[PDB]
Design a protein around this ligand. Sequence first.
Ligand SMILES: O=C(CO)[C@@H](O)CO
Ligand SMILES: [Mn+2]
Length: 270
Amino acid sequence: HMKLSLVISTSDAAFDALAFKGDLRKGMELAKRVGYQAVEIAVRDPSIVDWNEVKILSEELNLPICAIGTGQAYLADGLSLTHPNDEIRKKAIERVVKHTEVAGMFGALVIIGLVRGRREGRSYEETEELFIESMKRLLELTEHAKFVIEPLNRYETDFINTIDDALRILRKINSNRVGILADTFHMNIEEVNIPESLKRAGEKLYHFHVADSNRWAPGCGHFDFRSVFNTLKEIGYNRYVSVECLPLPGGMEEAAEIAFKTLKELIIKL
Ligand SMILES: O=C(CO)[C@@H](O)CO
Ligand SMILES: [Mn+2]
């Protein structure tokens, strides 16, 4: 009952509103043509996008938006939920609230990846406490939003690198509106035994990102997707499997097609 989704890259609408709209339309039409059941997007600042135009596009194509990424809020705007400057922490929370407003229009998950920030020379314990405070604030501020924490590899952050790191935090937050997003590219570096890590996540696995070991289309590296999909079946995972990969080999369209074929075969034989 798993469903396949495609992450589509979009230009920043502040830089070029027409480019954003063009990228989005092209990406959603590509997704539908290949066979994906939903798309996933990433936006830096939701306040500059016309979301009713996006919803019309989603309706016309019968293509839901299943998740909204937030990482550029950190990479471009320096906003972090654990920033040592409480003013920036507040601005980060305010930004992510705007992401939840968009997510509510689509029934989408809000991804908490890089926007959580890094240790920045501090103890893990302090960073974790600040993060939990910020997540609790986000939950107090929202009635329906659902969040997923994505463990990322050591080169992207030193805060939450493993599924176990995230499960520990979920137990402290204590809300079913926060779960885990596992990403096979990141797990290939950070997890000891990936099937075991996913069993530990269990019901807390709310979303799934796939890319091969080199972050190319699934099928084009050496990651063992077979064992992963066996485990997803065993834990009863029935939500989205979202392709978040480099446009390789051979560009965005070719990568999306290769990814779909690889994943579809695994799912159907499972
Ligand atoms: O995996 C992610 C976002 O899901 C980060 O590495 C940024 O691409
Ligand atoms: Mn990811």
